Amino acid sequence: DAVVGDTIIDVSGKKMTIAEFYDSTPDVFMRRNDEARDWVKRVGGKTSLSVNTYSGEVERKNINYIMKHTVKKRMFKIKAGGKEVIVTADHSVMVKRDGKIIDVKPTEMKQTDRVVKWMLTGSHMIEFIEFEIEDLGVMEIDVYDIEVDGNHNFFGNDILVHASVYLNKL
C-alpha cells in the first residue's frame, strides 16, 4: 500500500515528487528484491511534515525510510480543496471522524468524515475539509511510502495520508 510516484511531498521544506525523492536517496537498502520489485532505503538527515494525532498539532519529523514497490492494485483518488492524492485501495488516508484524526481505507470513508489538508493561509496550518473519491480501477504502477518518525503520516499533494512503518525487525 502506498501513493503514486508523482505525489508531491515536503523534504526538509523543499518540494519534490516522492519518486524523485526515492531516486535521490543513496542506495542504502534495508530490503531489496528486484524480482518482487520491492525496495526499502534508509534515509538520513531529512524531515517532513506530519500531524500528531493526539495533540492535533503539525510537527516536523525525521524521515526514517523510503519504500518503492511495483504493484498491480486498485487505485483511488481523494479530491479535496482543489488538490488530489492517488492511493492504493489497501492504504489509509487520514480523516477527522468524531473529533479524532484516524486512518481509514478509501473504501471505508463516511460522508461525515473530513480529510486533513495543509493550509497556506490563516493562523491554522491545516483545515478539515469535505472531499470526493474517484475509483481509478486496477493499475500496474510504482507506489511509494515513507516512514515518518513518531506520527506515521505525511502530506501528499497537501492531503494527509497514513505512512508506513518499516519495523527493522532483524
Numbering used by the authors: 0 to 120, 120A, 120B, 120C, 121 to 166
Excerpt from the paper describing this PDB structure:
The Aes123 PolB1 intein, a representative of the rare cysteine-less split inteins, is of particular interest due to its resistance to oxidative conditions and orthogonality to thiol chemistries. The cysteine-less Aes123 PolB1 intein (in short: Aes intein) found inserted in PolB-type DNA polymerase genes from T4-like bacteriophages of Aeromonas salmonicida shows only about 30% splicing efficiency relative to its PN12. In this work, we identify β-sheet-dominated aggregation of its N-terminal intein fragment as the origin of its low (~30%) splicing efficiency.
To this end, we also solved the crystal structure of an AesN-AesC fusion at 1.38 Å resolution to confirm that selected residues indeed formed β-sheet structures and to choose sterically fitting substitutions. Interestingly, two of the three strongest APRs within AesN (APR1 & APR3) are directly in contact with AesC. The structure also confirmed the presence of the recently discovered motif NX histidine as a unique residue conserved in cysteine-less inteins. We then designed mutations within the predicted regions of the C-terminal half of AesN. Amino acids were changed to ones with a lower propensity for forming β-sheets. Mutations towards polar and in particular positively charged side chains were preferred to avoid counteracting the electrostatically driven association with the AesC precursor. In the following, we focused on the mutant 1P(T69K/F75H/M118N), from now on termed CLm intein (cysteine-less monomeric; 15P), as it retained the best ultra-fast splicing activity with t½ = 16.3 s, only about 3.3-fold slower than the WT, and reached 89% splicing efficiency.
